[PDB]
Copies of this chain bind each other. A is one copy, B any other.
Amino acid sequence: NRLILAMDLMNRDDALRVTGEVREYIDTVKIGYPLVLSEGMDIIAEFRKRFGCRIIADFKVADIPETNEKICRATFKAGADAIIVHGFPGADSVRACLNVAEEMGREVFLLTEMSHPGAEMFIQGAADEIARMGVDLGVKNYVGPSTRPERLSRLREIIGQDSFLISPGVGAQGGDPGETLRFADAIIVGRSIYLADNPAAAAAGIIESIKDL
């Protein structure tokens, strides 16, 4: 695959239909707050049972250590395989997530630099240090921006070749599968697939581009 579906539809019926339509082209579904806050955490269990795919909970966890632990424990209890957590709040907040993931046999992904224009204001300047903090904490899974492949390159340099790196911002945000997969292990794609007239054809089209690399 190398393709992770960002399932940000907000209606259970549509989320299930689109995921079902594209599942032959992905092995991982990324579920975030647009779907969870609309349909409840039980949606994570349903997706697991219906589809079998890995579930990453994209909750961009960004609270104090005590609250981060509670968020992680609720999320894994609901059946998520991994959770995405922000590095910007610092090492104690990240460690809290890693401690729960250890307890529960799950994975943490560290979000380093974000893909949107606003990320340039504060996040970008800290992002190398956030990545290096990850390495120092023993984080093995990272998120970095498809929209800035030169920053992906730098992040890959920091985390090394033996870390797993996934990357949002492909399609709608302007990122390209090829420029991104030079550095990331897998791309995250939401709207380019789930808003397409034929999501299966969109996913298939992306997979064809990936195979050509």
Interface residues of chain A, those whose CB is within 8 Å of chain B, are 8, 10, 32-34, 36-38, 40-41, 59-60, 62-67, 70-71, 74-75, 78, 86-94, 114-123, 126, 129-130, 133, 172-173, 191
Q: Are A115 and B34 in contact (CB under 8 A)?
A: no
Q: Are A40 and B38 in contact (CB under 8 A)?
A: no
A65 to B10, CA, bound (A): 16
Q: Are B34 and A71 in contact (CB under 8 A)?
A: yes
A88: B residues at CB distance < 8 A: 88, 122-123
- A to B CB contacts below 8 Å, 17 in the list: A33-B59, A34-B67, A34-B74, A37-B71, A37-B78, A64-B173, A65-B116, A65-B118, A66-B172, A88-B122, A89-B114, A89-B116, A89-B122, A90-B117, A92-B116, A94-B118, A122-B126
A43 to B94, CA, bound (A): 28
A123: B residues at CB distance < 8 A: 88-90
Q: Are B130 and A122 in contact (CB under 8 A)?
A: yes
A34: B residues at CB distance < 8 A: 67, 70-71, 74
Most buried by B among A8, A34, A130: A34
User: Nearest residue in B to A127 (C-beta to C-beta)?
Assistant: B122
A49 to B144, CA, bound (A): 42
Most buried by B among A66, A90, A93: A90
Q: Are B37 and A89 in contact (CB under 8 A)?
A: no
**Smallest beta-carbon distance A152→chain B, Å:** 17
A71: B residues at CB distance < 8 A: 33-34, 37
A92: B residues at CB distance < 8 A: 116-118
Q: Are B130 and A70 in contact (CB under 8 A)?
A: no
**Smallest beta-carbon distance A145→chain B, Å:** 10
User: Nearest residue in B to A34 (C-beta to C-beta)?
Assistant: B70
A57 to B60, CA, bound (A): 16
Q: Are B90 and A122 in contact (CB under 8 A)?
A: yes
- Other A-B contacts than A10-B74, A37-B74, A126-B126, 12 sampled, CB-CB below 8 A, are A8-B67, A10-B70, A33-B59, A33-B67, A40-B41, A65-B118, A88-B88, A89-B118, A89-B119, A90-B120, A90-B122, A122-B129
